[PDB]
Amino acid sequence: MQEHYQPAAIEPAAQKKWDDARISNVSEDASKPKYYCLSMFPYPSGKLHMGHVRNYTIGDVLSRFKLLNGFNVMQPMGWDAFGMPAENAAMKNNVAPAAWTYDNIEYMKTQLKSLGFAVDWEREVATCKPEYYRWEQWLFTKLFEKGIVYRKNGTVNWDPVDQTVLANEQVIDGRGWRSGALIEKREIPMYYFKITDYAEELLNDLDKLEHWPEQVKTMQRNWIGKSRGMTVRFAVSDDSKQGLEGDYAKFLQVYTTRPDTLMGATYVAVAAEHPLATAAAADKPELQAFIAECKAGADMATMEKKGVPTGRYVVNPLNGDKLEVWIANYVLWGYGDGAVMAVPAHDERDFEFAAKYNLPKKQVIAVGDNAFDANRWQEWYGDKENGVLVNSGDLDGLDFQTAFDAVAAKLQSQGAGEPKTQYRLRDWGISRQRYWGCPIPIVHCEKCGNVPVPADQLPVVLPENVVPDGMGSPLAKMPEFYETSCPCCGGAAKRETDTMDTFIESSWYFFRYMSPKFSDGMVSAESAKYWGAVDQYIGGIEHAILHLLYARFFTKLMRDEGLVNVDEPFERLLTQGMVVCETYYWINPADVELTPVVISGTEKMSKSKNNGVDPQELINAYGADTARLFMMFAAPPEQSLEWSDSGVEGAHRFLRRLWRTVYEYLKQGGAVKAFAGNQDGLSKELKDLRHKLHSTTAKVSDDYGRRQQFNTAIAAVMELLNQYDKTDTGSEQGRAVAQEVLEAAVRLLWPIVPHICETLWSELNGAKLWEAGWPTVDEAALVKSEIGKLRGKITVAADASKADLEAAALANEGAVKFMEGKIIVVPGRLVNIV
């Protein structure tokens, strides 16, 4: 054994050893219990930085923990390769996005392989390859035929200068980002997944996810946004029918989730495009301009709420009050009825609207004896659970649910309204007017219409010999791509030139890893049956809503097609915290050392301030194990992690110390058979070290397996080494216990720092580390030894309580013979019955 720790020497040798034994290349091995650990696969956008490395280290720690415990572990890796990053670089560097993407993949694969992650590279996928994306084209065509995917006009942000469609993120103050030209809203045909048909399933199945963080489930429930409420109709007054046709001449219909407060409605509000808004605005120039301002305008709660009165009235069907209709900019045409009622005394938005315009407020709910103040909003005004109806005539005294049913009763009997369930969830628009994405497998025929490509003609292949220029999608300018023949009639036709939302690839990639070479389907039945669901998913909170909901949606779509048999894709979910670092100017922290540049503020590792720390720089300086160790030790995985030059150094020193501990141990006599069995006759000090050892094994196992807090696992091993360092292990029985401690220490740490622990393990023991397996707890090592006047002595467990001593004291042969018909308890010394 070499004396000094040389990571640049041992790490490639250890990685070579693991690849040769194919430890991480796995099959559907029925002889071993499966474990599917998955980290969110990256966009191949450049270099990974320490932030990404934290994510993949965590996955590797859990994977290797399960490996050592005998599982058949699949830890797959892959490339989320479509999307905007490459198209910017395609414009930026005058390079094909494909060429730039594949180049990126190679740099990052070697980056990852150098960190020593236990990854099945034979299951690697790149989502920009036709062998991948053909299967999401296939699913598209199957769902299109069933109407689960449909085509429909939607409105988009058109920039007339750049001549491209803009995302709302790129629409600042009404104008485009790279142009500052006023955005034109355009109606164009687009494709949608009917995700609203699955809203109830997506919502209720969250309850199954007992090993998901509660806030993730809460964000999903709120995004879906189910409500059980009331459709309510307000008769238009005789004086207000002016201009209205059809059912709009008869009644104004709203949706409300507080029908229990209908007796406190003091005005109503309609969207700019509502027919009432149009009829009122006919001879009223002020309303015309307000309608116009609304049409041009996420930012809902942020925007100043505005309205104008219309002079039109509707009648409350419960109390007969004539209420004025307002046009308001917060009422959106396309959600529910495009009109709402307003209850300023019990809804905070209505309260502010009403306090702005001096509109009436009517208290119709009281909460205990809390007093009502029409000039100050108070949280209890909105109380749905502890309030009870006041000023509501007949309804006076009911609670929310009974008044709901009473109002539903009354309304239905008048024909004036019915209960209704609504969802905030919109359908999922997947059309993108971008080149670097999966082609939509539709052909447009002037005779047959929009027709799906037949399955045997899939994939529709995206040409990779393209350099976009940002002045439109190149596919719409590429005759050799879009000219084709109709699959239904043989006539001349045109391919769809929009590509798919690149969330589509990340919505099923975890199934493709089960059989990434399968050519007869998205995923083979044999492999989906074996791998089941992802046991453990690790990724950033930024994907807690859309990506996770889409992946759950796709799972249920695929189950309903018969391709998988689970309802939910991810059993456990771990949300690793951000990684932050000081900034400098914008100079990368590897171009800087400190005691001329400006040492600015600490913030998330990103390209914005060029403060991403390149893991390759960190490997070249200290080795992979030091990088892994620093990030697993610096903070619990969920907490944010501050980059620290001294933290990295102190991780490295720990690895030197661990190296030197095994070396000095082996210099003083070479390896011995590790202590095992009965420890009676061991000295107190070696008993205490064995106690620390097996306590440490139980804690690390709990920290890896239950708590997933790796930083405290490492601290516990350092404690063991500390007690080892103060224990005389020179004797024969001492060396056997030292061997036991070191064989367990290097195994306990192997998931965190596998290169050094693989190397040290082999100097200690000739067996293969993964066959020796995860260290076991020796419970016998966890048992400590047993411990008026005076008349009796008793033997007590070392963990005996003060009532166990008083128990055995009161029942002693010398006590009872001196009792003749207070009990001061000194633990470990004496007990006296006075």
Ligand X SMILES: CC(C)C[C@H](N)C(=O)NS(=O)(=O)OC[C@H]1O[C@@H](n2ccc(=O)n(C)c2=O)[C@H](O)[C@@H]1O
| The Cα angle at residue 335 between residues 331 and 341, in degrees rounded to 5 | 45
Q: What strand order describes the sheet that includes 149-159?
A: 164-166, 149-159, 184-193, 428-429
Binding-site partner at residue 516 among ligand X, Zn ion, none, CB < 5 to 8 Å by type: none
Smallest distance from the beta carbon of 627 to ligand X, in angstroms? Answer: 14
Structure tokens at 681: 């006759």
Of the pair 269, 538, the CB lying nearest ligand X is at 538
Binding-site partner at residue 609 among ligand X, Zn ion, none, CB < 5 to 8 Å by type: none
Binding-site partner at residue 306 among ligand X, Zn ion, none, CB < 5 to 8 Å by type: none
Q: If binding is defined by CB under 5 A, does position 300 make contact with Zn ion?
A: no
Q: If binding is defined by CB under 5 A, does position 447 make contact with Zn ion?
A: yes
Residues 623 and 595: beta-carbon distance below 8 Å: no
Which of the ranges 263-271, 485-493, 569-577, 639-647 carries the binding residues for Zn ion, by CB under 5 A? 485-493
Residue nearest to Zn ion (CB): 486
Q: If binding is defined by CB under 5 A, does position 484 make contact with Zn ion?
A: no
- DSSP character string of 817-829: HHH---EEEETTT
- DSSP character string of 772-814: H-SPPP-GGGGPPPP-----------TT--HHHHHHHHHT-HH
Q: If binding is defined by CB under 5 A, does position 448 make contact with Zn ion?
A: yes
Which of the ranges 387-395, 448-456, 645-653, 729-737 carries the binding residues for Zn ion, by CB under 5 A? 448-456
Smallest distance from the beta carbon of 460 to Zn ion, in angstroms? Answer: 16
- Name which position in 171, 425, 488, 736 contacts Zn ion (CB under 5 A): 488
Smallest distance from the beta carbon of 579 to ligand X, in angstroms? Answer: 4
Binding-site partner at residue 445 among Zn ion, ligand X, none, CB < 5 to 8 Å by type: Zn ion
Instruction: Compute, in degrees rounded to 10, the torsion defined by CA atoms 157, 160, 165, 168.
Output: -40
Which residue has tokens 């415990």? 69
Smallest distance from the beta carbon of 628 to ligand X, in angstroms? Answer: 14
Of the pair 41, 436, the CB lying nearest ligand X is at 41
CA 524 to centroid of chain Cα atoms: 27
Cα(354)–Cα(340) distance, integer angstroms: 14
Cα(418)–Cα(251) distance, integer angstroms: 14
Binding-site partner at residue 43 among ligand X, Zn ion, none, CB < 5 to 8 Å by type: ligand X
Q: By the criterion CB under 6 A, which residues form the site for ligand X?
A: 40-43, 51-52, 54-55, 80, 506, 539-540, 543, 547, 576, 578-579, 605
Residues 44 and 101: beta-carbon distance below 8 Å: yes
Of the pair 639, 668, the CB lying nearest ligand X is at 639
Smallest distance from the beta carbon of 493 to Zn ion, in angstroms? Answer: 6
Of the pair 512, 690, the CB lying nearest ligand X is at 512
Residues 530 and 523: beta-carbon distance below 8 Å: no
DSSP letter for 416, please: S
Among the listed residues 570, 569, 596, the one whose alpha carbon sits nearest the alpha carbon of residue 584: 596
Binding-site partner at residue 307 among Zn ion, ligand X, none, CB < 5 to 8 Å by type: none
Chain residues 558-587 in contact with Zn ion, contact rule CB under 5 A = none
Residues 438 and 126: beta-carbon distance below 8 Å: no
Smallest distance from the beta carbon of 455 to Zn ion, in angstroms? Answer: 18
Smallest distance from the beta carbon of 398 to ligand X, in angstroms? Answer: 48
Of the pair 313, 503, the CB lying nearest ligand X is at 503
- DSSP character string of 683-734: -HHHHHHHHHHHHHHHHHHHIIIII--HHHHHHHHHHHHHHHHTS---SHHH
Which residue has tokens 């208290």? 363
Of the pair 202, 605, the CB lying nearest ligand X is at 605
Residues 345 and 337: beta-carbon distance below 8 Å: no
Q: If binding is defined by CB under 5 A, does position 453 make contact with Zn ion?
A: no
Smallest distance from the beta carbon of 468 to ligand X, in angstroms? Answer: 21
What's the length of the chain? 834
Smallest distance from the beta carbon of 529 to ligand X, in angstroms? Answer: 24
Taking each helix axis from N to C terminus, what angle separates 615-622 and 50-68, rounded to the nearest 10 degrees?
Answer: 60
Smallest distance from the beta carbon of 138 to ligand X, in angstroms? Answer: 21
Of the pair 408, 579, the CB lying nearest ligand X is at 579
Of the pair 442, 573, the CB lying nearest Zn ion is at 442
Of the pair 406, 578, the CB lying nearest ligand X is at 578
Of the pair 246, 490, the CB lying nearest Zn ion is at 490
Q: Which residues bind Zn ion (CB under 5 A)?
A: 445, 447-448, 486, 488-489, 491
